[PDB]
Amino acid sequence: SVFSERTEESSAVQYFQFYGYLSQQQNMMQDYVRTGTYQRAILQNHTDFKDKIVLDVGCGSGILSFFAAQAGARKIYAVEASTMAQHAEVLVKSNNLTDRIVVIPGKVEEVSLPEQVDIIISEPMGYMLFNERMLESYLHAKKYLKPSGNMFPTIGDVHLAPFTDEQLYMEQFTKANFWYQPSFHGVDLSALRGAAVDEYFRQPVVDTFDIRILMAKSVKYTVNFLEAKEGDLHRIEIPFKFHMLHSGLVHGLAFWFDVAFIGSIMTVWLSTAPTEPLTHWYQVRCLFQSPLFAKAGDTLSGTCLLIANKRQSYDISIVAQVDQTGSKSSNLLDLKNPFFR
Amino acid sequence: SVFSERTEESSAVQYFQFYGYLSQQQNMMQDYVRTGTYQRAILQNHTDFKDKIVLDVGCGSGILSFFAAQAGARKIYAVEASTMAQHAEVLVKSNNLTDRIVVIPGKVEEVSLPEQVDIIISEPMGYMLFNERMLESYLHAKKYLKPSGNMFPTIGDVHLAPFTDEQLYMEQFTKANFWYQPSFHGVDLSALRGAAVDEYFRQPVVDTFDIRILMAKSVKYTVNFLEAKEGDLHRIEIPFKFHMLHSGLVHGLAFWFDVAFIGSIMTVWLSTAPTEPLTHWYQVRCLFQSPLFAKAGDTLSGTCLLIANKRQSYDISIVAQVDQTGSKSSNLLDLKNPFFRYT
Amino acid sequence: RSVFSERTEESSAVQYFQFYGYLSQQQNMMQDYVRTGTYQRAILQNHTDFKDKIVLDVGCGSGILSFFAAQAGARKIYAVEASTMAQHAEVLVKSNNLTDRIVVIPGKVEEVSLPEQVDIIISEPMGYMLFNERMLESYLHAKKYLKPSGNMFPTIGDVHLAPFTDEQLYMEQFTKANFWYQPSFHGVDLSALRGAAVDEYFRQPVVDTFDIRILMAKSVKYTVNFLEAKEGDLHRIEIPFKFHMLHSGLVHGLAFWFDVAFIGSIMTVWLSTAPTEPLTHWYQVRCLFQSPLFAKAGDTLSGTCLLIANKRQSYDISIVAQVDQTGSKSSNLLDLKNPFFRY
Amino acid sequence: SVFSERTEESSAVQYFQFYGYLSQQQNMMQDYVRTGTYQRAILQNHTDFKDKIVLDVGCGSGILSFFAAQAGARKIYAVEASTMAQHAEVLVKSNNLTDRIVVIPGKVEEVSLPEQVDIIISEPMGYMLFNERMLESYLHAKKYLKPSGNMFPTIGDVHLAPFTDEQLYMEQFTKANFWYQPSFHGVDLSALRGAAVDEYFRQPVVDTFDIRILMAKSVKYTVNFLEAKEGDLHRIEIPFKFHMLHSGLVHGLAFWFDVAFIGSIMTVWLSTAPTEPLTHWYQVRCLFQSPLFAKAGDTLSGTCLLIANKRQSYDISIVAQVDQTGSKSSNLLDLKNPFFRYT
């Protein structure tokens, strides 16, 4: 199957084991912004659901399917690969919705549905939007979508912006500098100092921050889920040209994302921007090993290249340069091993 | 091989990916009690190392081998299965000990060593001592130990004691009761409340606590690494009969461990007890599904049975009863997936 | 052929005496009330050590100390000064109507000839970390003019060194050095020079003051007795130390200050530049380690601070320090001539 | 050599020791206006460099030569007399430019170049442009310049303008009046007040200021590096006739400078004017010993004479008079010892 071909078993086991825990479902569900925004998007666009066939990709507890049921859907296929599918069924029964919500245990790339659906719902977004590679399952599921069918969310915007945060930088450098010691309990560790810096700086920093650390208006990269195919997400090339609004050291790039539910009645946005209330996605920052100095008015240009890997994540390559001076930085990050700060 | 036969590959992948990080090695190395005590044990027992052949099981960065070198070891075979072996190789070279230290990449159950050693060193202890099941790798390596050889550490003591922590116990239900609401965004979640409670109680709690919550002097279970076999750790039955020092509700059992380096010159102890400075092992608490009331002077008896699984961990089965009243409580826990509670 | 010229690069000497030729610098020194007031106290409170005596003032500058000696009743004061400040001193001697008692002799104390032997030598020859500027050697050299039963003001000097913790200072220097870490400064890769840069920045003693609570152990004292010492004694100054750590943490380096004692017939007067005392224009001096050493309370931090005099009227400082319990060792080289004024 | 003949060894040693520090180089490199403007001037005039032979006089870290390399230069001879030459060589190697940049250690007046160059680049500007006397080295280097070769910078403009700053003026006496007290610790210092005032007014003041203190349009003195000789800078006479735009007291003359890179594609300016972003050169003010009153419309005429000395600096003689009243003022300043006032 498409899933297994692109996924190491070791990663898959851990991945679906992780989501088999009720506590994580709770963790996601208690994100009121997330859950509330999804419910708002579905219910205020009830006509996109009324008497329609729905596919819920990765239903987990089934919350989105219940939202779909509340909006008047005739029949909802709720596909779930982890052992959470069993608990979802329990909830379907206890809520007397057996006639409208149908749990399909298994991976969306592998199960069989009896019919084509009018709309696909899912919450497949990870850190930096693309982490976990579930967007590909979401897009893969379009094999079950009627020609003029719809998707909730409809589009996803990734925002990139340069930031300055010396304390974060030195915080990481401090950690790496442990390996700078010439005599740790009499042992010279210095020969590994380089490897340590690499390892620590390969970690995207997951957390939130004040918006004023941003040195330029963000650049936007849009994925249209109605149009995109799986393969489009195997290699994601995001070119950027920032017009610096402030002078200073650029320590790296900050990432967040929005998704839009473009329904018939209205468009509803779910945003993880640092200007918006905090969500469990927070924001993600990729550090440069060495910061770049730029004056206000300069242009910071380059490319963020995301390469999907078999561990359900991405190898991140960031190349950025101050055009006016030729000051250049290249960096490689492992989105699979982030730093929760 | 013995390792792969007792280990789910997925778990192994994850396991050796974990230790391939310099940050995790650093994490262990910066635990001053651990590292310093190992160094102390090795150097203060220099006659156990000077001109000796040494085997370092799971050398990681190679720190213990360097300690062995400082103590005067003639030849040190440093075995390491993760990609940390590469960095150890680098450090051996940069510290000009290539003539004394030989890094061997691979699992100790699978690599070939050329000769028998005088002493084996290792740090194979996990949560509750036994987690990660590396102790078995440590014992397995005794196929390379001379009949009159030594083990550093030489013995390992796991300590169990009954505790009272009303808030910890009630916490589980406070969290589980999230699901006990008839209209979470219009959804009745209550049918899953029981499952949520179960899930939380299956997790051993990793963190520390004030020693005053302990209601009896601990019971000790000793593994003598010089004498024990690998197989001895597949099923570990720890019977206990606690003499209660305080009256109250017993919510479960607290776990910690000590290891002793018994050298020719002296014995050095490394302790993770809650009476001692905190280590990266912290302490572990397993809850009873139902608390048991015990009076001071009463006896709390039962068994902690540790059953090794192929996920490099243990299923913990605890049965306990107050002998004076017959009040009985049990729990079953999955040590591979503990709850890190420490704040 | 003078000892001064033999031990001093001319380039350094020119600059050195030009520096002190400025009235603004004299003002700077004179306006340090602790210094000036304490000197006056030491001299006047021991007036009988001066009354009707012959005095030598080594490096009189503006001549203030000679005036103190005159106030104390000295019969004749030879005020030796090598810079052009000697002329300004003469002016003050005349305008203060003391031409009959204070005699300015322009030139280096190693080169001028005095008409007679003196009963007491006074001077203010202390530099940063006491020994900087190498004027103590001129002070000691001047003892060729001292009567057998003569005295020295100051009589002794105590250097105090103690380990400190100051993460922010360390990071402050490392941040500066990290400029040379850049792989593309305007398209230029500077990284190959980071090692040289870190060296250069950490080669600088930090001159300023600090909170006494950053000190992690009671100070160690090294005493120079000016009555007994020879010039040659200060070419190589070896200060061994063994600190008993009072606090756990990272030792980022050693902090230095000094006291001098005026041991007079009537009383002993102390001039202290310790961080517990009111600030002086000497402040305190800290030598950073390139890598801090972790030590817990109760540990011993031992080693040596070695000062080698150079021809630039300063010292090459080599500090070697080790945590005895762990063998964690740090070595450092500092250039006392080029310190970092942080205040 | 020409250099040693015009320079006291003392000054030269201090001078090249100063620039031997990576931190000082860093200080210059971190001046974004300076460095960035040089890079722009070179790169935006790429036709002046593409496949050309280049001489970098006093390359320091070698940054300008790397800029020349970025512009497509065939061969750059980078001459450097301090120990920074060692580090420059390192950077050429690590940047894989050994085939195009040749570091030549030594003074440009003493080294030999293998061939003639098409263009000379350098940053020889000091305070008020002429300080350090490096412009003479820059001009001296034209013995290696092909006829019709180019100079980057091509010209240097020194700007002089009368200013009013009552507080700056009064500050001098405020400081000098320290010596005007009849009993400083019992000593009458007053006889030296005059000398202290003199000393303070001999120091050019380095810092920046509000442009509204300027009382007339600046007068400009231009050095064309393509045409000028070394000897032209031994005696620099700058006559001035200022047409006062504001009424008030003139306390002295303010100095700044611009340099122009006149390339084939465009002319790029580097300015240190008080109307422009601040540089490490700041601006320089020379006070009159007595302020001059001028009405708006009056004419302030006179001369600024710069006489080069062997300390790699200038003796500044300024004479000015208000033509309408005959009110006259003079001052003599020592540019080698300026007062860094900037805060």
Ligand SMILES: COCn1ccc(NCCNC[C@H]2O[C@@H](n3cnc4c(N)ncnc43)[C@H](O)[C@@H]2O)nc1=O
């Ligand atoms: C750590 O930050 C929190 N976080 C991060 C990412 C994320 N992603 C939502 C996606 N849900 C995943 C659910 O679908 C399930 N499945 C994930 N991939 C699936 C597939 N191919 N086929 C079927 N089901 C699939 C999975 O088991 C889960 O129940 N949600 C979060 O709240």
Ligand SMILES: COCn1ccc(NCCNC[C@H]2O[C@@H](n3cnc4c(N)ncnc43)[C@H](O)[C@@H]2O)nc1=O
């Ligand atoms: C700069 O930081 C603060 N600080 C540090 C050290 C210091 N030392 C006093 C030294 N001045 C006393 C005078 O001796 C003079 N001379 C110094 N060496 C001399 C010699 N060999 N012969 C004659 N005079 C000599 C020197 O010119 C001075 O004017 N004073 C300070 O306030």
Ligand SMILES: Nc1ncnc2c1ncn2[C@@H]1O[C@H](CSCC[C@H]([NH3+])C(=O)O)[C@@H](O)[C@H]1O
């Ligand atoms: N069977 C095995 N063979 C070889 N290495 C192993 C095995 N099991 C675990 N390890 C390694 O054992 C190490 C335990 S961590 C202790 C590392 C080091 N001796 C120190 O004291 O800091 C990890 O680096 C694992 O990769």
Ligand SMILES: Nc1ncnc2c1ncn2[C@@H]1O[C@H](CSCC[C@H]([NH3+])C(=O)O)[C@@H](O)[C@H]1O
């Ligand atoms: N006569 C001379 N010959 C060679 N180098 C010199 C001479 N005089 C000064 N220098 C050097 O010239 C440099 C001036 S500083 C400018 C450094 C570098 N070009 C930059 O743009 O950052 C210093 O490094 C001095 O050591």
